[PDB]
Amino acid sequence: VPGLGRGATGFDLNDTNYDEFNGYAGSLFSSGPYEKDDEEADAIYAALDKRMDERRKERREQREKEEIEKYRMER
Amino acid sequence: SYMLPHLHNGWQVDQAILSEEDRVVVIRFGHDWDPTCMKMDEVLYSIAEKVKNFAVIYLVDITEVPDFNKMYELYDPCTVMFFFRNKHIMIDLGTGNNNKINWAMEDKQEMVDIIETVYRGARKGRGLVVSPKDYSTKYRY
Amino acid sequence: KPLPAPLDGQRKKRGGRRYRKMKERLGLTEIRKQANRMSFGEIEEDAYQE
Amino acid sequence: LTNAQRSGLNQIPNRRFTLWWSPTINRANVYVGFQVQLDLTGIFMHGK
Amino acid sequence: VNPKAYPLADAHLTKKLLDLVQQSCNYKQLRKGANEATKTLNRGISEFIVMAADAEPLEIILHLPLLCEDKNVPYVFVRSKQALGRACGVSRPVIACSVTIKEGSQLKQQIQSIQQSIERLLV
Amino acid sequence: EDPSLLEWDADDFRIFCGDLGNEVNDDILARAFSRFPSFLKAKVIRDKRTGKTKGYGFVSFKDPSDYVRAMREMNGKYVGSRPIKLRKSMWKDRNLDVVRKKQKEK
Amino acid sequence: TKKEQKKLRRQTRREAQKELQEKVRLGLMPPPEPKPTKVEAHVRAQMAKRQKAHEEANAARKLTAEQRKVKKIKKLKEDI
RNA sequence: UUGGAAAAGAUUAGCAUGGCCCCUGCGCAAGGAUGACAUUUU
């Protein structure tokens, strides 16, 4: 039985889900057509995004590792 | 991690509202890890056995129980709705909408008086009671 | 102990006898005139003594 | 009486104060109009 | 019961005893308590002493037989302190009661008969 | 003298329930009191030309032993949507207020 | 004990008042008598009714003429 | 007399029953002192 079985009537879109940039969290997709060629395509595009983040990857990931380590050391 | 009871689907919520005949069903709609809901649940826990003669307090997760999101307009982090004998008791708080609380009050005596007002106006039969305070201004000086 | 459920009184429907003593304890025969009043026109005291 | 009832019993003189100074508080110069006429009554209430 | 509780009143005698102690409570002839029974034995105003065999320890009233032999006063043990306490008009257990002499009071015939009956019990 | 008071009486006792919800209770009151004292007659005063309920209702019980337990248990008990209030029936008709006026001057 | 006599008497009397008001609640009888020459002449007849009812409740339960005799006998004739 | 058109019950107060105590009367329980010279009623 739903919430209507109470005898009720009204008189994720929570603001915890909202964010002023990026909109609402959660993706619209993930359903509807994922297949062979969709998996190969996001392999190609994920390799492209990893390749674009290969520019500064050593220095960026080293800075992030050191900052989370000293942030967990201090607080 | 509260001592307040939790309802985990729509049947538990609607039968928890229908369970009480002489007590206000106080229902917090929100997530336990939210800071606003954490402060509101601290306030509801510190008065849960004070107002036990005329109220009952239930916590409801929005992710676990999402069917009341559209009807009750549960789009703020915490909402606190008040029911008495299956009737939704609205409260003219001054916030603009009367249906929910929708913020975390820090005074536990204000929550006691809001529950006591809902009880007095609901046993009298009103679907809308008037809060014994105006919450439009935050009264900070 | 919890708060009592805020029911109102059934009510005092019988009067005199015990009930006049019930109010003569605390809510007794007051002045009922010029102690509960403010006297609109006049100022009887010095003005802002309160 | 309850703490909320003591609160309301102390807001009673605010009620008689507001009703007393009503003709100069409930005018249109004071609260710019969102003139809501009172129900079954010819009073307009500038400002909630 | 306790073997040192001697003499011990049987059921008919303890019914008469508790009714006489109740009447003496009504006639204000009764002093409840082991200290008040000790006092009215020392003052010599006691008609007779009843005691409770179910007093633990018993010896907190077993000085009272010796006082009843040094004052020539009849003494007798009731079966339990709760019945004796209720027979004194108090809800608490009373382990030793002194029915006392009064100025020509109307219980003197009942008190004399019970005295003659409980001086037959120590045999 | 309304010709409708004569459907309950068998020298039986009537309880007066009032403060009842005018949107419902036409036979809800009978339903609630039915467990007590075997099939009985319980009316609700719904006035004519309107179809609106005037509030009060009369439940006629077979016993005044039954009556005391019923009254004590169902006082303020949630029935339809308003807690019922319970008192004893007046029935101050002609043959008793004539006796009352004759008892006034004595 | 005397406190228990007071409590037993008061609770027997509370159920007695409760069952008299119960018999009023059933409606068997109108309630009992609650308490210038004409009004206290009425109440004089009613207090005569009241004192007469006290003498009625003493008139029955009286040990008529021989119930005294059988109770004096059961006082004097022991269980030899 | 006839025809016709049309607060989910409040508040304040007085009397009485109730409580208590004294006394009287009645009762219940236990007392106290005393006075009197199996053949025939189917």
Swiss-Prot record, chain B:
- Record gene name: TXNL4A
Query: Domain of life of the organism in this record?
Result: Eukaryota
Changes after translation: The disulfide bond seen in structures determined by X-ray crystallography and NMR is not essential for protein folding and function.
- Recorded protein name is Thioredoxin-like protein 4A
Q: Which residues carry this modification: Phosphoserine?
A: S131
Keyword Phosphoprotein listed? The answer is yes
List the PANTHER family: THIOREDOXIN-LIKE PROTEIN 4A (PTHR12052:SF5), THIOREDOXIN-LIKE PROTEN 4A, 4B (PTHR12052)
In UniProt terms, what function does this protein have?
A: Plays a role in pre-mRNA splicing as component of the U5 snRNP and U4/U6-U5 tri-snRNP complexes that are involved in spliceosome assembly, and as component of the precatalytic spliceosome (spliceosome B complex).
Which organism does this sequence originate in?
Homo sapiens
Curated annotation (Swiss-Prot), chain C:
Give the multimer and partner information.
Answer: Identified in the spliceosome B complex. Component of the U4/U6-U5 tri-snRNP complex composed of the U4, U6 and U5 snRNAs and at least PRPF3, PRPF4, PRPF6, PRPF8, PRPF31, SNRNP200, TXNL4A, SNRNP40, DDX23, CD2BP2, PPIH, SNU13, EFTUD2, SART1 and USP39. Interacts with a complex formed by SNU13 and U4 snRNA, but not with SNU13 or U4 snRNA alone. The complex formed by SNU13 and PRPF31 also binds U4atac snRNA, a characteristic component of specific, less abundant spliceosomal complexes. Interacts with PRPF6/U5 snRNP-associated 102 kDa protein.
Q: What is this protein called?
A: U4/U6 small nuclear ribonucleoprotein Prp31
Modified positions (Phosphoserine) in chain numbering:
S39
According to the entry, what is the taxonomic lineage of the organism? Eukaryota, Metazoa, Chordata, Craniata, Vertebrata
Q: In which tissues is it expressed?
A: Ubiquitously expressed.
Report what the Swiss-Prot or TrEMBL entry states about this protein's PTMs.
Phosphorylated by PRP4K during spliceosome assembly.
Q: Which disease is it linked to?
A: Retinitis pigmentosa 11: A retinal dystrophy belonging to the group of pigmentary retinopathies. Retinitis pigmentosa is characterized by retinal pigment deposits visible on fundus examination and primary loss of rod photoreceptor cells followed by secondary loss of cone photoreceptors. Patients typically have night vision blindness and loss of midperipheral visual field. As their condition progresses, they lose their far peripheral visual field and eventually central vision as well.
Residues of the region (Disordered) are: 1-17
Q: Where is this motif: Nuclear localization signal (NLS)?
A: 11-24
- Which family does the similarity line name? Belongs to the PRP31 family.
Curated annotation (Swiss-Prot), chain D:
How would you summarize the oligomeric state and partners of this protein?
A: Part of the U5 snRNP complex. Component of the U4/U6-U5 tri-snRNP complex composed of the U4, U6 and U5 snRNAs and at least PRPF3, PRPF4, PRPF6, PRPF8, PRPF31, SNRNP200, TXNL4A, SNRNP40, DDX23, CD2BP2, PPIH, SNU13, EFTUD2, SART1 and USP39. Component of the U5.U4atac/U6atac snRNP complexes in U12-dependent spliceosomes. Within the minor spliceosome, which acts on U12-type introns, interacts with PPIL2 and RBM48. Core component of U2-type precatalytic, catalytic and postcatalytic spliceosomal complexes. Found in a mRNA splicing-dependent exon junction complex (EJC) with SRRM1.
What tissues express this gene product? Widely expressed.
> Domain notes, please?
The MPN (JAB/Mov34) domain mediates interaction with TSSC4 and SNRNP200. Has structural similarity with deubiquitinating enzymes, but lacks the residues that would bind the catalytic metal ion.
Subcellular location per UniProt equals: Nucleus; Nucleus speckle
Superkingdom field: Eukaryota
Which segments carry the region annotation Important for branch point selection? Answer: 1-9
Task: Quote the protein name from its UniProt record.
Answer: Pre-mRNA-processing-splicing factor 8
Swiss-Prot record, chain F:
Keywords, comma-separated and alphabetical: Acetylation, Cytoplasm, Methylation, Nucleus, Phosphoprotein, RNA-binding
* Gene Ontology BP terms: mRNA splicing, via spliceosome; negative regulation of mRNA splicing, via spliceosome
- Is Nucleus among the key words of this record? yes
Q: Which domain of life is it from?
A: Eukaryota
Main subcellular localization, coarse class? nucleus
Give compartment(s): Nucleus; Cytoplasm
- Cite the RRM domain residue spans from the record: 13-91
The molecular function GO annotations come to: mRNA binding; RNA binding
> Which cellular component terms (GO) are annotated to the entry?
cytoplasm; nucleoplasm; nucleus; U4/U6 x U5 tri-snRNP complex
Function in brief: Binds (via the RRM domain) to the 3'-untranslated region (UTR) of CDKN1A mRNA.
The family annotation for this protein states: Belongs to the RRM RBM42 family.
Assembly description? Interacts with HNRNPK.
> Which protein are we looking at?
RNA-binding protein 42
> Organism, per UniProt?
Homo sapiens (Human)
Placed within the complete protein, the shown segment runs 369 to 474 of 480
